[PDB]
Amino acid sequence: ATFEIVNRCSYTVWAAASKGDAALDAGGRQLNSGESWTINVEPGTNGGKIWARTDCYFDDSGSGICKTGDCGGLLRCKRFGRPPTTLAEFSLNQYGKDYIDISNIKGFNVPMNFSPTTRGCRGVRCAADIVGQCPAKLKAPGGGCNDACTVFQTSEYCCTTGKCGPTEYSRFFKRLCPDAFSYVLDKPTTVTCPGSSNYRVTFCPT
Template sequence: MLQPLLFAFLFFAFVAARQARLAAAGHAPHHYMNRFKIAKRQSGDANTPLMLTNWCPDSVWPAIDSQGGTGPSNTGFELASGDNQTEYVSSDWQGRVWGRTNCTFSGHGGGSACTTGDCGGLEACQGPGAPPATLAEFTLNGGQQQTFYDLSLVDGYNLPMAIVMLPNSNTDLTTLDPSTTNPSCVASAGNLAPPTFNPYTNSQQFLGTDSNSPLPFDTKITAATISQWCPWDLQVTPPSKPANGAYPYPDTKIPRPAFDPCYSACAKYNTDAYCCTGTADERGKCSPNYYSKAAKQVCPDAYSYAYDDQDSTFVQPTGGGFQMIFCPGGRSTDIIGRKGVGVIEHT
């Protein structure tokens, strides 16, 4: 396991990318590592694969935002249910990937074309998307030949997502245990499998793993709790009020929509306490809030607020590619809770 100071040194590039994202979204930099800066580098070796896979029942519009290195020329497109598309980035790429939902593009931009994850009405994104959006974040070469990546709910949640590491015949990566490299976040009622979920019967594989190295899944969340996890005030589309204009109490008895995107407290209210900015811009002064606690329960391996980094960031040698799967099915992984944070730091 990385010692704290060494981890901080290696993590500077990853954090710098997060600072740029928050600044672009209107939030001040909030992380204790904001003293580090990283310049955008342009390189020509755009041969690292990013595979986008859609297992959702409807189309998803993946978006790719680059903050360093060389990103793909195709930064947004429609991905039909069951389809795959691979884009390529450089080995020093920094950026993030997310899925947009229910999009209709006019071709002119402006306004909003998607219900979640929108990029200013553009199909080809030219910057960060609007929250809420489940993010896959990457710094492919953050120093000392280390790659950093995570699933992030810091900007909220819109779609289930998994990250599968692709070794690319790199011997440093082919020997890694895939049950410690492939996190998944499933926080939508319609996508959640029962607590007894076992994808490995009949020698089947799931998210790059098999029965010899099975993923550890969360077993606590139920169909009832998954449908109510988003705090009431953070729902993008809360249920309509009844005819008398008042919600019954408690609100846990009110049916919610099957597609129930959730803002983070930071994304909705933009306060120092929720965003770990200003007077709360130090570890110890910014604590998990009501949203991040709820998010961490349904997606234990996901990044839930600004200072959740050292418990949610996966580290491995450079050289690998990645597959992002929208609506992977199954259940959220609990790699860190079941195996310990040290197992996700492959140094």
């Protein structure tokens, strides 16, 4: 499958693409304002994620640091990123279908649209000003709005027992972005697309 990743933000982001134990394609790249990066993701990929990182410094070896979404200090991510990260999530060719969603379960850093470029399903978006409106206790100093699990590390926020409810914090994310997951057991906002669809992830879509 092909994913076109487009930075419409007025600032540079460092895109990242991983399935948790391996890079997808190159794994990461700098995207200046307006730039597009096309990646190929193997059919059958389960548990893939794409995200943006902000305020990164990398040396000539591809080693460094980002203020949001850092993946062990590498430009080319092999592992998932440090919250807060708005997440585009996908599993491809699962019994003939692709499944896509946006998640705020690991917080929010950059607004995002995740849409198919081929026919047969709709896209999803979270483009509200979550950072501006972020509750004080969830504000990340480096930028972004943390989820409550990351901040407080309780069974209720992290849904550790497999039983948890919505919270004041999850409801904040849900109010601003209804079409994104706000906590682990949120009513699913997953979209079912035809197997082997292609996609575009747009940072700062509006």
